[PDB]
Design an enzyme around this catalytic site. Structure first.
Site, mmCIF file in Angstrom:
data_model
loop_
_atom_site.group_PDB
_atom_site.id
_atom_site.type_symbol
_atom_site.label_atom_id
_atom_site.label_comp_id
_atom_site.label_asym_id
_atom_site.label_seq_id
_atom_site.Cartn_x
_atom_site.Cartn_y
_atom_site.Cartn_z
ATOM 1 N N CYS A 93 -5.487 0.535 10.748
ATOM 2 C CA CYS A 93 -4.096 0.276 10.412
ATOM 3 C C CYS A 93 -3.168 0.671 11.551
ATOM 4 O O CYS A 93 -3.110 1.833 11.949
ATOM 5 C CB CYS A 93 -3.698 0.997 9.119
ATOM 6 S SG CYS A 93 -1.967 0.673 8.644
ATOM 7 N N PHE A 97 -7.209 4.381 6.304
ATOM 8 C CA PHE A 97 -6.547 3.443 7.221
ATOM 9 C C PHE A 97 -7.531 2.526 7.960
ATOM 10 O O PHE A 97 -7.191 1.879 8.947
ATOM 11 C CB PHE A 97 -5.573 4.166 8.160
ATOM 12 C CG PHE A 97 -4.438 4.817 7.435
ATOM 13 C CD1 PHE A 97 -3.356 4.045 6.969
ATOM 14 C CD2 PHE A 97 -4.456 6.186 7.174
ATOM 15 C CE1 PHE A 97 -2.300 4.631 6.256
ATOM 16 C CE2 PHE A 97 -3.412 6.796 6.461
ATOM 17 C CZ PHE A 97 -2.327 6.018 6.002
ATOM 18 N N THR A 137 0.802 -1.211 0.000
ATOM 19 C CA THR A 137 0.000 0.000 0.000
ATOM 20 C C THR A 137 0.846 1.278 0.000
ATOM 21 O O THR A 137 0.509 2.279 -0.629
ATOM 22 C CB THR A 137 -0.931 0.024 1.222
ATOM 23 O OG1 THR A 137 -0.191 -0.364 2.387
ATOM 24 C CG2 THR A 137 -2.101 -0.944 1.022
HETATM 25 C C1 HEM Z 1 -0.483 3.943 2.767
HETATM 26 C C2 HEM Z 1 -0.147 2.841 3.442
HETATM 27 C C3 HEM Z 1 -1.194 1.963 4.135
HETATM 28 C C4 HEM Z 1 -2.520 1.954 3.917
HETATM 29 C C5 HEM Z 1 -3.301 2.792 2.867
HETATM 30 C C6 HEM Z 1 -3.106 0.982 4.825
HETATM 31 C C7 HEM Z 1 -4.444 0.671 4.919
HETATM 32 C C8 HEM Z 1 -4.988 -0.257 5.787
HETATM 33 C C9 HEM Z 1 -6.402 -0.558 5.983
HETATM 34 C C10 HEM Z 1 -7.590 0.119 5.281
HETATM 35 C C11 HEM Z 1 -6.513 -1.526 6.887
HETATM 36 C C12 HEM Z 1 -7.860 -2.098 7.359
HETATM 37 C C13 HEM Z 1 -8.169 -3.517 6.865
HETATM 38 C C14 HEM Z 1 -9.598 -3.975 7.184
HETATM 39 O O1 HEM Z 1 -10.329 -3.289 7.989
HETATM 40 O O2 HEM Z 1 -10.012 -5.049 6.621
HETATM 41 C C15 HEM Z 1 -5.161 -1.894 7.303
HETATM 42 C C16 HEM Z 1 -4.805 -2.873 8.214
HETATM 43 C C17 HEM Z 1 -3.520 -3.288 8.530
HETATM 44 N N1 HEM Z 1 -2.302 -2.723 8.112
HETATM 45 FE FE1 HEM Z 1 -2.249 -1.049 6.923
HETATM 46 N N2 HEM Z 1 -2.089 0.445 5.604
HETATM 47 C C18 HEM Z 1 -0.900 1.039 5.211
HETATM 48 C C19 HEM Z 1 0.353 0.798 5.724
HETATM 49 C C20 HEM Z 1 0.712 -0.242 6.542
HETATM 50 C C21 HEM Z 1 2.038 -0.528 7.038
HETATM 51 C C22 HEM Z 1 3.292 0.305 6.714
HETATM 52 C C23 HEM Z 1 1.969 -1.624 7.805
HETATM 53 C C24 HEM Z 1 3.106 -2.340 8.566
HETATM 54 C C25 HEM Z 1 4.349 -1.856 8.610
HETATM 55 C C26 HEM Z 1 0.610 -2.065 7.809
HETATM 56 C C27 HEM Z 1 0.122 -3.151 8.473
HETATM 57 C C28 HEM Z 1 -1.217 -3.422 8.649
HETATM 58 C C29 HEM Z 1 -1.712 -4.494 9.476
HETATM 59 C C30 HEM Z 1 -0.888 -5.500 10.283
HETATM 60 C C31 HEM Z 1 -3.228 -4.415 9.383
HETATM 61 C C32 HEM Z 1 -4.219 -5.316 10.103
HETATM 62 C C33 HEM Z 1 -4.265 -4.792 11.541
HETATM 63 C C34 HEM Z 1 -5.382 -5.484 12.281
HETATM 64 O O3 HEM Z 1 -6.502 -5.664 11.705
HETATM 65 O O4 HEM Z 1 -5.117 -5.874 13.443
HETATM 66 N N3 HEM Z 1 -0.137 -1.203 7.032
HETATM 67 N N4 HEM Z 1 -4.261 -1.094 6.609
#
Ligand code: HEM
Length: 460
Positions: A405, A398, A273
């Protein structure tokens, strides 16, 4: 008033008898397709498929309700249920009520603390310096393939901060094999849901190819672990917590199997992402020259040392706005899914039963003329000058709530640092007059975006 309003019938696009709407996902750009439907049917519509009923929402009005965690929990969209075939019950693909979600959420969150973050900085810079020097070292008329490079940076970065492991993507002129297999595994996951007949032997090569790629990804995990097993560390990072940390609630560390899943999940989530974002940010910048000048002028003014300090990235108030305005138009994770905890009624007009699924179509949400204004397709970072002028739940790249996130500060800090440095060290040119073509590998990116940088000749 409270419920004075009367039951409205829920709009729904063309169905096809017993496959319902499944045929409408005959496309390699389903999100973009769904945005077209929401343009037609408005704030909400039903969408069925054999063994699937979901409801797409595109208005701040309804998403505000949907994001109310007293009424709705996180759901696994069909897309995530399939990705689950290789990401297991890692953080992204587990249910809130599942034991390893809570376990790993508790064990790992410390990796995203303020203290942790301050330490990732020097490593982000290490990788960011590589990107710049690669561009410094191009010959004239040589060009930059932007998404392939952003992917080099973001994967190298998660690999280094998360795992103390070097992919050395900048030492390859093709993509890293992990990336290649990841992309195929992801693109297969997306295809498994345009398929009416999953077991038709025409798909038996796909299946075999899928296991081939999954083995590729796992062999990288094997390497990552062995490299850690074989040394004494400085590192206190994600991997450290995965391998050694214990749940405060139970006293137990994660099992070997789930650890392998978290590693895959963070390799993917932790770059994919963020690469899309950096690729889009750069797009809008070359497509809106006056905006680029203002950002480049902040870079010049703020980044006075040869390499940026943690404090300086935080002063890049305008680059940050650019990144947010890029996420608004094309949120690189373009959807997330919720389900009703009880029988309820959404927005006064549409009843739901316990268990009923919703899908937040984030690109449409971000295009709600009520909220943003008429010029909704206009890239304009200045919409972000005043955080209070943006309603809550109007801007949601996010995700939401407990399952939002955890990587958000990590991601913006990385993107801000890199974009800042790019703007400081280069003048950019859209030499092809690139036409935006958005590829959907379950996240979004501007496919085939290419530019020419011209060095400002500032030493590193
Ligand atoms: C622009 C960058 C990013 C965007 C747009 C983004 C977006 C999102 C979104 C929308 C979710 C929600 C998923 C859901 O509700 O089904 C999510 C979850 C998550 N993201 Fe990101 N994210 C970004 C960067 C990152 C980074 C840098 C990491 C780790 C270094 C990361 C790790 C995670 C993890 C582990 C989840 C699941 C957390 C949980 O549900 O416990 N993401 N992200």
């Amino acid at each position: 008033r409270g419920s004075h309003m009367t039951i409205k019938e829920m709009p729904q696009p063309k169905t096809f008898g017993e496959l319902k709407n499944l045929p409408l996902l005959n496309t390699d750009k389903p999100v973009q397709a769904l945005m077209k439907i929401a343009d037609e049917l408005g704030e909400i519509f039903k969408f069925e498929a054999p063994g699937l009923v979901t409801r797409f929402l595109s208005s701040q009005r309804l998403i505000k309700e949907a994001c109310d965690e007293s009424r709705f929990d996180k759901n696994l969209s069909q897309a995530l249920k399939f990705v689950r075939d290789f990401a297991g019950d890692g953080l992204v693909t587990s249910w809130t009520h599942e034991k390893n979600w809570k376990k790993a959420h508790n064990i790992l969150l410390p990796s995203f603390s303020q203290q942790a973050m301050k330490g990732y900085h020097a490593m982000m810079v290490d990788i960011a310096v590589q990107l710049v020097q690669k561009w410094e070292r191009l010959n004239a008329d040589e060009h930059i393939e932007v998404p392939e490079d952003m992917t080099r940076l973001t994967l190298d970065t998660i690999g280094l901060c998360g795992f103390n492991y070097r992919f050395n993507s900048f030492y390859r002129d093709q993509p890293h094999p992990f990336i290649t297999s990841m992309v195929r595994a992801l693109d297969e996951a997306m295809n498994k849901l345009q398929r009416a007949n999953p077991d038709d032997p025409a798909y038996d090569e796909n299946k075999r190819q899928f296991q081939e790629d999954i083995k590729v990804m796992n062999d990288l995990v094997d390497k990552i672990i062995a490299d850690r097993k074989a040394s004494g560390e400085q590192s206190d990072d994600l991997l450290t917590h995965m391998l050694n940390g214990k749940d405060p609630e139970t006293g137990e560390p994660l099992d070997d199997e789930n650890i392998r899943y978290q590693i895959i999940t963070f390799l993917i989530a932790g770059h994919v992402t963020t690469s899309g974002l950096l690729s889009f940010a750069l797009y809008f910048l070359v497509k809106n020259p006056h905006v680029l000048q203002k950002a480049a002028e902040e870079a010049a003014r703020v980044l006075v040392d040869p390499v940026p300090s943690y404090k300086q990235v935080k002063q890049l108030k305008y680059v940050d706005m650019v990144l947010n305005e890029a996420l608004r138009l094309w949120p690189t994770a373009p959807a997330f899914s919720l389900y009703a905890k009880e029988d309820t009624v959404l927005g006064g007009k549409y009843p739901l039963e316990k268990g009923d699924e919703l899908m937040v179509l984030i690109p449409q949400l971000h295009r709600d003329k009520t909220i943003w204004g008429d010029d909704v397709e206009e890239f304009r970072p200045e919409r972000f000058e005043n955080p209070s002028a943006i309603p809550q739940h109007a801007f949601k790249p996010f995700g939401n709530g407990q399952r939002a996130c955890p990587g958000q500060q990590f991601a913006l800090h990385e993107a801000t640092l890199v974009l800042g440095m790019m703007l400081k060290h280069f003048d950019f040119e859209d030499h092809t007059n690139y036409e935006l073509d958005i590829k959907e590998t379950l996240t979004l990116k501007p496919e085939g975006f290419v530019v020419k940088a011209k060095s400002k000749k500032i030493p590193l």
